[PDB]
């Protein structure tokens, strides 16, 4: 009825991608447990968490893994769809147009995101083949649900995604806000988009607008700074991140979310992630990283939960410790923020050809932030993509893109660290390829059986 409802249905719509299935767990640690960094503790077999992804052997029937994060991410879009009509429909009792088109972008963005969240992890990388094959289904209005679409391919996804973010940005904040979108949020987020889809001039395009225009209202962390930023809420170069307390959700992010399945626990209980010797011996080139603050032993010492290679190394990642820095159920969810933007310019810049000397200094603006060591930083003779890549690696460690790193370069995924868990063996999951039939998860069963028009992807 009224902008406060609106606002209301607006705010909802954060609070359920903020919550368990969404960003709280499923799609904040997916992207670091496929790739190489980031491994199981233990495996806990079907419909659990974190081992099916990491060993590439989730089911269609997986709830958790599975039915959740794919009904939960199509709530959140059908949310959006009926806030969005119901502004367009004109029947808010509201004059001020600034603000509901203010919400309707804000939704818009949210829309593009959640279908770009599901294209990417239920459809082979757009890389692969210009998006030919088959990504998921595509709603833009409320459910018909008689109706039983189709999947539409990786490509008419992600030209849904782009449309939605880029006709949102004149309708959003300019100013810094707290919690949800702004313009500065949905240009860093078209820049991770238009990177996945090898769009390099278009992500050049998206990320140093938000590096140059700005207007000071983000930083990136000087190395002095590194250590205390984290669990720490809004910190500068946060650009879009979900508000968590212990009151919303109830709870805060819980036992599954990922802040507690990185707890580094007085008793094993959460866990089930930690840090691979593969990490760990990449940030071990540099001693004088910053980010070695991070890693952490386990509190317990002689842990027998551990595998007994990792007992006393530091594979405990200390970036989600909690507001007060023992609760990380606490713990903001930082969405996108300024260190991604930078390195997206700077892979984006070399991948092009072109602005190569611009690129470069990005790279060099993240590594002279985060070591003492002068010669790390990049000339135009050391700078290149494998070095770019390793700077991901070492940033981005948990904040779940590392994976796409790997697909959208069509370069093999390999776990060489010696405590990786044995179930890799028997799950052929040493080595993933970007073209594994396996990176695309299998689309719930409940929708095969449910929908004859809905096909599986292939195994
Ligand atoms: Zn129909
Ligand atoms: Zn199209
Ligand atoms: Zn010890
Ligand atoms: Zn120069
Ligand atoms: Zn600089
Ligand atoms: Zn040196």
Same mark, same amino acid.
């Given at each position: 009825?009224?902008?406060?409802?609106?606002?209301?249905?607006?705010?909802?719509?954060?609070?359920?991608?903020?919550?368990?299935?969404?960003?709280?767990?499923?799609?904040?640690?997916?992207?670091?447990?496929?790739?190489?960094?980031?491994?199981?503790?233990?495996?806990?077999?079907?419909?659990?968490?974190?081992?099916?992804?990491?060993?590439?052997?989730?089911?269609?029937?997986?709830?958790?893994?599975?039915?959740?994060?794919?009904?939960?991410?199509?709530?959140?879009?059908?949310?959006?769809?009926?806030?969005?009509?119901?502004?367009?429909?004109?029947?808010? @009792? !509201?004059?001020?147009?600034? *603000? $509901?088109?203010?919400?309707? /972008? #804000?939704?818009?963005?949210?829309? &593009?995101?959640?279908?770009?969240?599901?294209?990417?992890?239920?459809?082979?990388?757009?890389?692969?083949?210009?998006?030919?094959?088959?990504?998921?289904?595509?709603?833009?209005?409320?459910?018909?649900?008689?109706?039983?679409?189709?999947?539409?391919?990786?490509?008419?996804?992600?030209?849904?995604?782009?449309?939605?973010?880029?006709?949102?940005?004149?309708?959003?904040?300019?100013?810094?806000?707290?919690?949800?979108?702004?313009?500065?949020?949905?240009?860093?987020?078209?820049?991770?988009?238009?990177?996945?889809?090898?769009?390099?001039?278009?992500?050049?395009?998206?990320?140093?607008?938000?590096?140059?225009?700005?207007?000071?209202?983000?930083?990136?962390?000087?190395?002095?700074?590194?250590?205390?930023?984290?669990?720490?809420?809004? @910190? !500068?170069?946060?650009?879009? *991140? $979900?508000?968590?307390?212990? /009151? #919303?959700?109830?709870?805060?992010? &819980?036992?599954?979310?990922?802040?507690?399945?990185?707890?580094?626990?007085?008793?094993?209980?959460?866990?089930?992630?930690?840090?691979?010797?593969?990490?760990?011996?990449?940030?071990?080139?540099?001693?004088?990283?910053?980010?070695?603050?991070?890693?952490?032993?386990?509190?317990?010492?002689?842990?027998?939960?551990?595998?007994?290679?990792?007992?006393?190394?530091?594979?405990?990642?200390?970036?989600?410790?909690?507001?007060?820095?023992?609760?990380?159920?606490?713990?903001?969810?930082?969405?996108?923020?300024?260190?991604?933007?930078?390195?997206?310019?700077?892979?984006?810049?070399?991948?092009?050809?072109?602005?190569?000397?611009?690129?470069?200094?990005?790279?060099?603006?993240?590594?002279?932030?985060?070591?003492?060591?002068?010669?790390? @930083?990049?000339?135009?003779?050391?700078?290149?993509?494998?070095?770019?890549?390793?700077?991901?690696?070492?940033?981005?460690?948990?904040?779940?893109?590392?994976?796409?790193?790997?697909?959208?370069?069509?370069?093999?995924?390999?776990?060489?660290?010696?405590?990786?868990?044995?179930?890799?063996?028997?799950?052929?999951?040493?080595?993933?390829?970007?073209?594994?039939?396996?990176?695309?998860?299998?689309?719930?069963?409940?929708?095969?059986?449910?929908?004859?028009?809905?096909?599986?992807?292939?195994?």
């Amino acid at each position: 009825v009224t902008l406060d409802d609106a606002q209301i249905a607006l705010n909802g719509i954060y609070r359920l991608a903020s919550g368990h299935s969404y960003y709280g767990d499923n799609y904040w640690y997916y992207g670091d447990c496929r790739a190489a960094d980031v491994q199981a503790r233990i495996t806990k077999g079907d419909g659990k968490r974190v081992s099916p992804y990491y060993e590439y052997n989730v089911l269609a029937s997986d709830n958790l893994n599975i039915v959740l994060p794919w009904n939960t991410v199509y709530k959140v879009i059908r949310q959006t769809n009926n806030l969005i009509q119901k502004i367009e429909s004109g029947s808010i @009792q !509201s004059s001020d147009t600034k *603000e $509901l088109n203010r919400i309707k /972008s #804000e939704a818009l963005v949210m829309r &593009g995101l959640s279908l770009f969240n599901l294209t990417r992890l239920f459809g082979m990388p757009y890389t692969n083949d210009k998006g030919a094959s088959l990504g998921v289904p595509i709603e833009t209005s409320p459910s018909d649900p008689t109706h039983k679409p189709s999947r539409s391919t990786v490509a008419q996804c992600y030209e849904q995604v782009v449309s939605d973010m880029s006709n949102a940005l004149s309708g959003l904040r300019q100013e810094t806000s707290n919690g949800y979108i702004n313009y500065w949020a949905a240009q860093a987020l078209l820049s991770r988009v238009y990177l996945n889809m090898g769009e390099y001039q278009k992500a050049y395009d998206a990320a140093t607008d938000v590096i140059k225009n700005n207007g000071g209202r983000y930083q990136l962390y000087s190395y002095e700074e590194y250590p205390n930023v984290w669990g720490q809420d809004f @910190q !500068s170069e946060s650009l879009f *991140e $979900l508000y968590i307390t212990l /009151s #919303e959700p109830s709870g805060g992010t &819980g036992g599954e979310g990922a802040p507690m399945v990185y707890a580094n626990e007085a008793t094993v209980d959460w866990n089930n992630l930690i840090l691979s010797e593969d990490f760990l011996n990449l940030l071990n080139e540099d001693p004088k990283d910053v980010r070695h603050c991070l890693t952490k032993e386990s509190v317990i010492e002689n842990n027998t939960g551990l595998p007994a290679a990792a007992m006393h190394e530091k594979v405990y990642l200390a970036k989600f410790p909690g507001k007060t820095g023992d609760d990380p159920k606490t713990n903001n969810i930082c969405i996108i923020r300024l260190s991604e933007v930078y390195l997206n310019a700077a892979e984006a810049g070399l991948k092009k050809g072109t602005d190569i000397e611009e690129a470069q200094g990005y790279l060099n603006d993240i590594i002279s932030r985060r070591t003492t060591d002068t010669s790390q @930083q990049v000339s135009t003779e050391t700078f290149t993509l494998d070095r770019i890549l390793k700077e991901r690696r070492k940033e981005l460690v948990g904040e779940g893109e590392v994976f796409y790193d790997y697909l959208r370069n069509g370069l093999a995924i390999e776990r060489k660290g010696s405590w990786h868990l044995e179930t890799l063996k028997a799950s052929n999951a040493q080595k993933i390829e970007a073209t594994d039939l396996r990176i695309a998860l299998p689309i719930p069963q409940s929708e095969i059986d449910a929908n004859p028009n809905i096909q599986q992807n292939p195994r």
